[PDB]
């Protein structure tokens, strides 16, 4: 062919997999090649809406556009076409609720984010009425505003027309995964996975089914609820208009469970912790649903060909969001800065901005800084912020120890920081494993899709393939350690007390 | 006129050869190792640079000179010379807390409280002197011969001024020593010996109007000696309660001829004129305007007055700036700085506010101890905001610069009753978290 005589072109590669990671504060799309390597990434923020202190909302059209654009972006940066994608995986910030019209797909309201605290009062009504018991028992969760069920009650009760249209069978409820699936397939598929369903307060974690009593209690019509599947299942096929190709959606799991999968935490006792705006630690607990006595959540780690693997989770609401406060709020300014702090000074930050999660579950606790001195500056605030990440992880793990009887795996952008992870090993007095790919949440769901599509290896292969970048080891003087640990316990008490 | 003036602050030393005819300042290093400390020399040099740079802006135009000082601040130096054995341990310093608690444990606190009008607390000089002698290498062996001079800043400053000729205190500064009987006006044998403080070390306690020697290009007689906080009152036509606002905040209410306090306050000497000693009740706050300095210098998030107005009114942010413990009326030397209530939203405006507000809250806490036992100046009392906010919060009027005493402004509460109870509850809540065990 004239003139391809001296013309160079690259062909193909095979086994490409697209993971969409619809996060709290941005959306990412990653293409993984047939070697499970990252080929191309799109990333894009969307607006955080705060209509009142403690209230948090996303525009779901904006989240939608962010998925469309981020996808196109990763594919182009990958040097391929949408037609080269064997399959898609979806993960998502959990608990976040969207309600939308089953016919037009128009949401009736902004998405109410997992961070949102607006139903505190309604959760108190239910608690006083003797109700937390069945929820805890059925669900593994608590009657806190964190979960979906309470937020969905709020939309049905406060958006005009909502309760009515819902009862007619005209509205769809979804966590963010269901919202994406619905839109990717152009309305064809109305579904979630067991892990996202776990998080709603509506689902029975033992029966693997929407729970009649809980839905009745919250006055949610069973109709509005999507079908619940395994994490690797058939979630439909991409609407061909969106990317110019029909791609099967084959992997879906909540972001913290996707990271759990991506860190190969498949066996009982294995544990991971993801560091983002919040921090979320999950312990693989095997076939058994461990009921915590130490203020942890019981949840579904994943459900795989009909089989549910369970987990214990600690959920820290403010982790990275603290340094984000330092940098954008106070603008007082990060491990670089933090290593420069005066050791003589003892400053603690308890970032209880709108309450405290595990293991405290104190929705009335507020932000507090301690131990300031006439000289304390940015450096020490910055240290207090990163150390608060450490100390809260610690308290999660100590609670896990009391619930269960094996080296901490760690991911999220925050951990590329050698100073922070070293400081983490120290305070834990335990070793810390940091992987080669930190985007563990994307890979976990990319694996689930890959493995079902058959272009990627099975569970045990993927598991032994887990690649360590770095084991951190504790190298802090014990005396020093005692001092740091005692100062934090005293910061905590001062923050929790009436 | 023509009287010289030396305001030996904690951060700086200001001068006024006063109408006014002198005005100069030079700042010095707050060496804070764990604790607070000044360089004794940097003081002697700064004082002798603040004199020759306030009188040029001759050597014999001043008839006398007048010394006021940061109180309680201790220095040990030699008799036959005057060499500082250690740094000035400063009134701010918390180091001797444990030693005080050893003393409270042996049951000594009541004899001190009774003879002294103060408390077993790191704030005052006696325990700092004790720390000197046990901690400096064989310094008591020095002191035990008479080779050491104790004395507060007035004495360090009246010493070197008179070329080692005069070694005196006044009775106000003497109240602050925790070694002095405030009724009998003497160094107490039991107090000093409990402290193992050899009386040879100690200076002659003179009057506020007395003959404290000739200076070193003139031969001028030191004839004025009280504490900045007592001479605050005598600057403040209160000879019959003033509140000073600089780095700390200090308030004293004239008691007339000894109110053995019931509300964690101080029994001190407002003055002693010709032997006839007038006492006041004291409320004393370690950090006030230093809280805003910290913002600008420590954290450097502010570049107070206007910003405090800019602050989101949905935000309940509070600051108990216990950088070095809390004075009146908590007397917790183990308390540290704490900030409460931060949100994603909290920015430089809300800290600034909380820090200006802090002085108002702490003020209030003193008067409520005063209006239970029984008018403000200072540099940081300039902004109308702060004073208005102070009148609002105290729910009481406040006045800002002999009937010869002149006013500028009296202040009035343009604040709602429930908004005040809201802002009051937050403080008290902030205070309780900072103080609990
Ligand atoms: Na290629």
mmCIF file with all atom_site columns, N, CA and C in Angstrom, chain A residues 128-164:
data_model
loop_
_atom_site.group_PDB
_atom_site.id
_atom_site.type_symbol
_atom_site.label_atom_id
_atom_site.label_alt_id
_atom_site.label_comp_id
_atom_site.label_asym_id
_atom_site.label_entity_id
_atom_site.label_seq_id
_atom_site.pdbx_PDB_ins_code
_atom_site.Cartn_x
_atom_site.Cartn_y
_atom_site.Cartn_z
_atom_site.occupancy
_atom_site.B_iso_or_equiv
_atom_site.pdbx_formal_charge
_atom_site.auth_seq_id
_atom_site.auth_comp_id
_atom_site.auth_asym_id
_atom_site.auth_atom_id
_atom_site.pdbx_PDB_model_num
ATOM 1   N N  . UNK A 1 128 ? -34.525 6.675  70.111 1.00 0.00 ? 128 UNK A N  1
ATOM 2   C CA . UNK A 1 128 ? -35.293 6.755  71.346 1.00 0.00 ? 128 UNK A CA 1
ATOM 3   C C  . UNK A 1 128 ? -36.420 5.775  71.292 1.00 0.00 ? 128 UNK A C  1
ATOM 4   N N  . UNK A 1 129 ? -36.880 5.485  70.075 1.00 0.00 ? 129 UNK A N  1
ATOM 5   C CA . UNK A 1 129 ? -38.044 4.630  69.874 1.00 0.00 ? 129 UNK A CA 1
ATOM 6   C C  . UNK A 1 129 ? -37.703 3.152  70.020 1.00 0.00 ? 129 UNK A C  1
ATOM 7   N N  . UNK A 1 130 ? -36.455 2.880  70.408 1.00 0.00 ? 130 UNK A N  1
ATOM 8   C CA . UNK A 1 130 ? -35.942 1.517  70.591 1.00 0.00 ? 130 UNK A CA 1
ATOM 9   C C  . UNK A 1 130 ? -35.453 0.848  69.312 1.00 0.00 ? 130 UNK A C  1
ATOM 10  N N  . UNK A 1 131 ? -35.113 1.640  68.284 1.00 0.00 ? 131 UNK A N  1
ATOM 11  C CA . UNK A 1 131 ? -34.886 1.016  66.973 1.00 0.00 ? 131 UNK A CA 1
ATOM 12  C C  . UNK A 1 131 ? -33.473 0.630  66.593 1.00 0.00 ? 131 UNK A C  1
ATOM 13  N N  . UNK A 1 132 ? -32.462 1.191  67.246 1.00 0.00 ? 132 UNK A N  1
ATOM 14  C CA . UNK A 1 132 ? -31.086 0.977  66.781 1.00 0.00 ? 132 UNK A CA 1
ATOM 15  C C  . UNK A 1 132 ? -30.706 -0.495 66.792 1.00 0.00 ? 132 UNK A C  1
ATOM 16  N N  . UNK A 1 133 ? -31.409 -1.270 67.622 1.00 0.00 ? 133 UNK A N  1
ATOM 17  C CA . UNK A 1 133 ? -31.080 -2.672 67.817 1.00 0.00 ? 133 UNK A CA 1
ATOM 18  C C  . UNK A 1 133 ? -31.221 -3.472 66.535 1.00 0.00 ? 133 UNK A C  1
ATOM 19  N N  . UNK A 1 134 ? -32.366 -3.388 65.861 1.00 0.00 ? 134 UNK A N  1
ATOM 20  C CA . UNK A 1 134 ? -32.551 -4.200 64.629 1.00 0.00 ? 134 UNK A CA 1
ATOM 21  C C  . UNK A 1 134 ? -31.577 -3.774 63.533 1.00 0.00 ? 134 UNK A C  1
ATOM 22  N N  . UNK A 1 135 ? -31.443 -2.459 63.298 1.00 0.00 ? 135 UNK A N  1
ATOM 23  C CA . UNK A 1 135 ? -30.412 -1.896 62.395 1.00 0.00 ? 135 UNK A CA 1
ATOM 24  C C  . UNK A 1 135 ? -29.043 -2.470 62.732 1.00 0.00 ? 135 UNK A C  1
ATOM 25  N N  . UNK A 1 136 ? -28.613 -2.386 63.967 1.00 0.00 ? 136 UNK A N  1
ATOM 26  C CA . UNK A 1 136 ? -27.290 -2.831 64.198 1.00 0.00 ? 136 UNK A CA 1
ATOM 27  C C  . UNK A 1 136 ? -27.241 -4.269 63.807 1.00 0.00 ? 136 UNK A C  1
ATOM 28  N N  . UNK A 1 137 ? -28.238 -5.021 64.204 1.00 0.00 ? 137 UNK A N  1
ATOM 29  C CA . UNK A 1 137 ? -28.252 -6.448 63.985 1.00 0.00 ? 137 UNK A CA 1
ATOM 30  C C  . UNK A 1 137 ? -28.358 -6.916 62.539 1.00 0.00 ? 137 UNK A C  1
ATOM 31  N N  . UNK A 1 138 ? -29.275 -6.315 61.816 1.00 0.00 ? 138 UNK A N  1
ATOM 32  C CA . UNK A 1 138 ? -29.479 -6.582 60.414 1.00 0.00 ? 138 UNK A CA 1
ATOM 33  C C  . UNK A 1 138 ? -28.372 -6.148 59.494 1.00 0.00 ? 138 UNK A C  1
ATOM 34  N N  . UNK A 1 139 ? -27.776 -5.033 59.814 1.00 0.00 ? 139 UNK A N  1
ATOM 35  C CA . UNK A 1 139 ? -27.111 -4.163 58.903 1.00 0.00 ? 139 UNK A CA 1
ATOM 36  C C  . UNK A 1 139 ? -25.627 -4.090 59.149 1.00 0.00 ? 139 UNK A C  1
ATOM 37  N N  . UNK A 1 140 ? -25.253 -4.291 60.390 1.00 0.00 ? 140 UNK A N  1
ATOM 38  C CA . UNK A 1 140 ? -23.885 -4.114 60.855 1.00 0.00 ? 140 UNK A CA 1
ATOM 39  C C  . UNK A 1 140 ? -23.458 -2.666 61.070 1.00 0.00 ? 140 UNK A C  1
ATOM 40  N N  . UNK A 1 141 ? -24.409 -1.741 60.926 1.00 0.00 ? 141 UNK A N  1
ATOM 41  C CA . UNK A 1 141 ? -24.109 -0.346 60.908 1.00 0.00 ? 141 UNK A CA 1
ATOM 42  C C  . UNK A 1 141 ? -24.676 0.250  62.193 1.00 0.00 ? 141 UNK A C  1
ATOM 43  N N  . UNK A 1 142 ? -24.971 1.549  62.211 1.00 0.00 ? 142 UNK A N  1
ATOM 44  C CA . UNK A 1 142 ? -25.508 2.214  63.378 1.00 0.00 ? 142 UNK A CA 1
ATOM 45  C C  . UNK A 1 142 ? -26.605 3.097  62.873 1.00 0.00 ? 142 UNK A C  1
ATOM 46  N N  . UNK A 1 143 ? -27.385 3.703  63.767 1.00 0.00 ? 143 UNK A N  1
ATOM 47  C CA . UNK A 1 143 ? -28.308 4.769  63.353 1.00 0.00 ? 143 UNK A CA 1
ATOM 48  C C  . UNK A 1 143 ? -27.631 6.130  63.430 1.00 0.00 ? 143 UNK A C  1
ATOM 49  N N  . UNK A 1 144 ? -26.655 6.310  62.545 1.00 0.00 ? 144 UNK A N  1
ATOM 50  C CA . UNK A 1 144 ? -25.963 7.563  62.368 1.00 0.00 ? 144 UNK A CA 1
ATOM 51  C C  . UNK A 1 144 ? -26.326 8.107  60.972 1.00 0.00 ? 144 UNK A C  1
ATOM 52  N N  . UNK A 1 145 ? -26.299 9.450  60.774 1.00 0.00 ? 145 UNK A N  1
ATOM 53  C CA . UNK A 1 145 ? -26.601 10.095 59.490 1.00 0.00 ? 145 UNK A CA 1
ATOM 54  C C  . UNK A 1 145 ? -25.640 9.766  58.349 1.00 0.00 ? 145 UNK A C  1
ATOM 55  N N  . UNK A 1 146 ? -24.497 9.141  58.647 1.00 0.00 ? 146 UNK A N  1
ATOM 56  C CA . UNK A 1 146 ? -23.516 8.698  57.652 1.00 0.00 ? 146 UNK A CA 1
ATOM 57  C C  . UNK A 1 146 ? -24.154 7.821  56.525 1.00 0.00 ? 146 UNK A C  1
ATOM 58  N N  . UNK A 1 147 ? -24.951 6.836  56.893 1.00 0.00 ? 147 UNK A N  1
ATOM 59  C CA . UNK A 1 147 ? -25.468 5.871  55.947 1.00 0.00 ? 147 UNK A CA 1
ATOM 60  C C  . UNK A 1 147 ? -26.588 6.390  55.030 1.00 0.00 ? 147 UNK A C  1
ATOM 61  N N  . UNK A 1 148 ? -26.974 5.622  54.007 1.00 0.00 ? 148 UNK A N  1
ATOM 62  C CA . UNK A 1 148 ? -27.939 6.121  53.006 1.00 0.00 ? 148 UNK A CA 1
ATOM 63  C C  . UNK A 1 148 ? -29.384 6.295  53.487 1.00 0.00 ? 148 UNK A C  1
ATOM 64  N N  . UNK A 1 149 ? -29.848 5.336  54.302 1.00 0.00 ? 149 UNK A N  1
ATOM 65  C CA . UNK A 1 149 ? -31.295 5.117  54.519 1.00 0.00 ? 149 UNK A CA 1
ATOM 66  C C  . UNK A 1 149 ? -32.023 6.351  54.999 1.00 0.00 ? 149 UNK A C  1
ATOM 67  N N  . UNK A 1 150 ? -31.432 6.964  56.014 1.00 0.00 ? 150 UNK A N  1
ATOM 68  C CA . UNK A 1 150 ? -31.812 8.227  56.632 1.00 0.00 ? 150 UNK A CA 1
ATOM 69  C C  . UNK A 1 150 ? -31.796 9.418  55.653 1.00 0.00 ? 150 UNK A C  1
ATOM 70  N N  . UNK A 1 151 ? -30.792 9.478  54.797 1.00 0.00 ? 151 UNK A N  1
ATOM 71  C CA . UNK A 1 151 ? -30.797 10.537 53.778 1.00 0.00 ? 151 UNK A CA 1
ATOM 72  C C  . UNK A 1 151 ? -31.942 10.386 52.760 1.00 0.00 ? 151 UNK A C  1
ATOM 73  N N  . UNK A 1 152 ? -32.293 9.154  52.456 1.00 0.00 ? 152 UNK A N  1
ATOM 74  C CA . UNK A 1 152 ? -33.362 8.870  51.494 1.00 0.00 ? 152 UNK A CA 1
ATOM 75  C C  . UNK A 1 152 ? -34.755 9.170  52.101 1.00 0.00 ? 152 UNK A C  1
ATOM 76  N N  . UNK A 1 153 ? -34.955 8.771  53.365 1.00 0.00 ? 153 UNK A N  1
ATOM 77  C CA . UNK A 1 153 ? -36.100 9.269  54.130 1.00 0.00 ? 153 UNK A CA 1
ATOM 78  C C  . UNK A 1 153 ? -36.239 10.794 54.047 1.00 0.00 ? 153 UNK A C  1
ATOM 79  N N  . UNK A 1 154 ? -35.141 11.499 54.180 1.00 0.00 ? 154 UNK A N  1
ATOM 80  C CA . UNK A 1 154 ? -35.164 12.942 54.110 1.00 0.00 ? 154 UNK A CA 1
ATOM 81  C C  . UNK A 1 154 ? -35.602 13.472 52.766 1.00 0.00 ? 154 UNK A C  1
ATOM 82  N N  . UNK A 1 155 ? -35.123 12.878 51.679 1.00 0.00 ? 155 UNK A N  1
ATOM 83  C CA . UNK A 1 155 ? -35.601 13.346 50.344 1.00 0.00 ? 155 UNK A CA 1
ATOM 84  C C  . UNK A 1 155 ? -37.103 13.063 50.088 1.00 0.00 ? 155 UNK A C  1
ATOM 85  N N  . UNK A 1 156 ? -37.556 11.870 50.470 1.00 0.00 ? 156 UNK A N  1
ATOM 86  C CA . UNK A 1 156 ? -38.937 11.477 50.269 1.00 0.00 ? 156 UNK A CA 1
ATOM 87  C C  . UNK A 1 156 ? -39.852 12.382 51.054 1.00 0.00 ? 156 UNK A C  1
ATOM 88  N N  . UNK A 1 157 ? -39.397 12.800 52.231 1.00 0.00 ? 157 UNK A N  1
ATOM 89  C CA . UNK A 1 157 ? -40.187 13.659 53.087 1.00 0.00 ? 157 UNK A CA 1
ATOM 90  C C  . UNK A 1 157 ? -40.055 15.163 52.799 1.00 0.00 ? 157 UNK A C  1
ATOM 91  N N  . UNK A 1 158 ? -38.972 15.624 52.203 1.00 0.00 ? 158 UNK A N  1
ATOM 92  C CA . UNK A 1 158 ? -38.792 17.068 52.051 1.00 0.00 ? 158 UNK A CA 1
ATOM 93  C C  . UNK A 1 158 ? -38.848 17.607 50.641 1.00 0.00 ? 158 UNK A C  1
ATOM 94  N N  . UNK A 1 159 ? -38.690 16.764 49.627 1.00 0.00 ? 159 UNK A N  1
ATOM 95  C CA . UNK A 1 159 ? -38.920 17.293 48.271 1.00 0.00 ? 159 UNK A CA 1
ATOM 96  C C  . UNK A 1 159 ? -40.372 17.081 47.899 1.00 0.00 ? 159 UNK A C  1
ATOM 97  N N  . UNK A 1 160 ? -41.022 18.197 47.607 1.00 0.00 ? 160 UNK A N  1
ATOM 98  C CA . UNK A 1 160 ? -42.433 18.246 47.177 1.00 0.00 ? 160 UNK A CA 1
ATOM 99  C C  . UNK A 1 160 ? -42.703 17.264 46.039 1.00 0.00 ? 160 UNK A C  1
ATOM 100 N N  . UNK A 1 161 ? -43.751 16.481 46.195 1.00 0.00 ? 161 UNK A N  1
ATOM 101 C CA . UNK A 1 161 ? -44.118 15.545 45.173 1.00 0.00 ? 161 UNK A CA 1
ATOM 102 C C  . UNK A 1 161 ? -43.414 14.221 45.325 1.00 0.00 ? 161 UNK A C  1
ATOM 103 N N  . UNK A 1 162 ? -42.234 14.235 45.942 1.00 0.00 ? 162 UNK A N  1
ATOM 104 C CA . UNK A 1 162 ? -41.361 13.049 46.062 1.00 0.00 ? 162 UNK A CA 1
ATOM 105 C C  . UNK A 1 162 ? -42.064 11.846 46.650 1.00 0.00 ? 162 UNK A C  1
ATOM 106 N N  . UNK A 1 163 ? -42.673 12.024 47.808 1.00 0.00 ? 163 UNK A N  1
ATOM 107 C CA . UNK A 1 163 ? -43.221 10.874 48.503 1.00 0.00 ? 163 UNK A CA 1
ATOM 108 C C  . UNK A 1 163 ? -44.239 10.225 47.589 1.00 0.00 ? 163 UNK A C  1
ATOM 109 N N  . UNK A 1 164 ? -45.080 11.061 46.975 1.00 0.00 ? 164 UNK A N  1
ATOM 110 C CA . UNK A 1 164 ? -46.136 10.636 46.036 1.00 0.00 ? 164 UNK A CA 1
ATOM 111 C C  . UNK A 1 164 ? -45.574 9.869  44.849 1.00 0.00 ? 164 UNK A C  1
#
